[PDB]
Amino acid sequence: MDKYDKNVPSDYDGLFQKAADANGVSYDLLRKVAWTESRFVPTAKSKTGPLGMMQFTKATAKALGLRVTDGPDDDRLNPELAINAAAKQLAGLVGKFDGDELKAALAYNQGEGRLGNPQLEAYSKGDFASISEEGRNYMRNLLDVAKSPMAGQLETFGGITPKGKGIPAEVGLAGIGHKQKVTQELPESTSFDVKGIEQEATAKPFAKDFWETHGETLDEYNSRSTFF
Amino acid sequence: IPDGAKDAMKLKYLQADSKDGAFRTAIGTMVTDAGQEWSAAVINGKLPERTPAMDALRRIRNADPQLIAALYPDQAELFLTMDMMDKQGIDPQVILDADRLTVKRSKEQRFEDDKAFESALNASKAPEIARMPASLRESARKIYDSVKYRSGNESMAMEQMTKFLKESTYTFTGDDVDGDTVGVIPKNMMQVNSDPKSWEQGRDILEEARKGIIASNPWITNKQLTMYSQGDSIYLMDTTGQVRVRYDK
Amino acid sequence: ADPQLIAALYPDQAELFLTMDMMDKQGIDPQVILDADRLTVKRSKEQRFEDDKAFESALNASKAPEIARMPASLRESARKIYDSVKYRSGNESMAMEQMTKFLKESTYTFTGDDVDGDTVGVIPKNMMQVNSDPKSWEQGRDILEEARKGIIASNPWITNKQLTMYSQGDSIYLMDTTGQVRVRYDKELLSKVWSENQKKLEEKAREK
């Protein structure tokens, strides 16, 4: 997973354009958010591990106003309605932040409340020091595809010199990793299949064979032949 | 390679394998399933519509009889009994009934049953019944047990067995023999045509054969040969076994 | 759900369930089986042989054809009834009379022409009913008696022109010596045959 694969052959993206047009969200932002949350991975295992493309939590899933209490313990497993709900939430966030502010809407990552309101206030003041590390990293990951008036102030935050640019963790730690030594190539078993010689069919009884070849039974034959 | 060569190689590897090896473990599922099929059929009194394990094991036996007899004697004996019944034209329900009658009976009662059956046979007047070979006696006992199990009549079972055996077997006689009987052969094993009445021709060819062998080997004990039907063959044999002649249809 | 699998894996429970099924179809409470097992369990292997010999000798010396030539499967249930009565009292004569009276009025013995011993099978009466009325057992017997005469005519090659009649579970089997001729009947088929015969008879009476 490098550079988000912008121009990779788009796998299972027959849903983002429709949600984007329905709700007004940018296609690139929605696709990038989905990639960041789940990397389009069908399993998406974690502490909670929602395998859906939008890696929600139970509290957010219920607060979204859906019927989550259905199906396999959670209804937001079918991709289309979960993606549509996420797009609606993103559109509501973008619209409510005075214009096309595509990065304050990343309150989507932190929410609004005891831990999200002060960070949004700090973002409004332009004071990125009061935003958490998780929020700062999450906004840094979206700088390529986002339209914001503070997109240039965030990139020049954390530079080694005041004229430098900060380094996102996806770039500073890029390329450092180890391959898995275990693969899904399973060992195969073989059946002990010996197809020998077919068994001979059951014969007719001697009396039945006699009565079918000759129109009379053995007793009649013996009685008639012994008359003379 | 053709399938026969593949079967031969697989059976060579099966024979060379050790007691708890993987080759014997793979085919042990077949034997376990076949035994379970037969035991369940005996308990329920009816064979199921499908017995894949018994069919597979029987085909493997047809490929190599000695290996199966060496490794799984019980299934080999069962298959030999089924083969004899099949050649007589008897449905496996008879074997099921005989097994059902015998299984519900203690070891002390089985001895009494065997003694009673042997006494009833030895007291008969027909030569084919009073001096029956043991291999034929097993199938006769199964027929008698089936008839005695499905009804309560032992007299009916005896008459049914005797009538079935009289009209389907032929007893050969010798000159100056105590008891006069030298063997009993089923009639359909002496047929020279598809016509059952041709059994009389094949008997003649047999009767001149044992007279011709005795003339060629006058040194045999009492100038006597025994005639024994095994599988699909008829054996003319003397006392020492040095003179042995095989015939088939 | 699956009888053959249970018989293959757990034979003891399968045999127990078959015995309970036969008792249930006869209308007998499991307390009889419990009493018979209680009588047998407190008895050594040497005494069980003597008990079996005595019971078989008592049966073979009877005068009723249903008792002297009883099939083994019916003999097991008869032995259980006899053992229960002989266990709850001390009277073996009472147990014998109770067993014989119970078996006389609930079973029917079929006979054949020129058969040594004359018996070809014993069938419980309630397995030959064509209605809910018990007295209808006589109709289902007739349908059976004409069946075995019709099969013998169609298959004259059978050993002595004789068939055995055997009741297993809820079915009645007409079978020859070799097993090549086997015919199955049940209360549904007996009822259907009886209904067809009644329709034919009533239409013949109406239109003639």
Task: Please explain how this structure is put together.
This is part of a larger assembly, with one copy of chain A (228 residues) and two copies of chain B. Chain A has 228 residues and is mostly helical. Chain A has eleven helices and no strands. Chain A has a domain at 15-173: Lysozyme (Orthogonal Bundle), CATH 1.10.530.10. Chain A is 39% helix and 0% strand. Chain B has 249 residues and is mainly α. Chain B has helices at 3-16, 22-44, 52-63, 65-71, 73-88, 92-103, 107-122, 127-130, 134-150, 154-166, 199-216, and strands at 169-173, 181-186, 226-230, 233-237, 244-248. In chain B, strands 3-4-5 form a three-stranded antiparallel β-sheet, with no helix packed on it. In chain B, strand 3 (226-230) and strand 4 form a beta hairpin. In chain B, helix 2 crosses helix 3 (52-63). Chains B and C meet through helix 2, helix 6, helix 9 and helix 10 of B and helix 1, helix 2, helix 4, helix 6 and strand 2 of C. The PDB classes it as viral protein. The entry lists the keywords T7, ejectosome, ejection protein, genome-delivery, podoviridae, viral protein. Structure of T7 DNA ejectosome periplasmic tunnel.
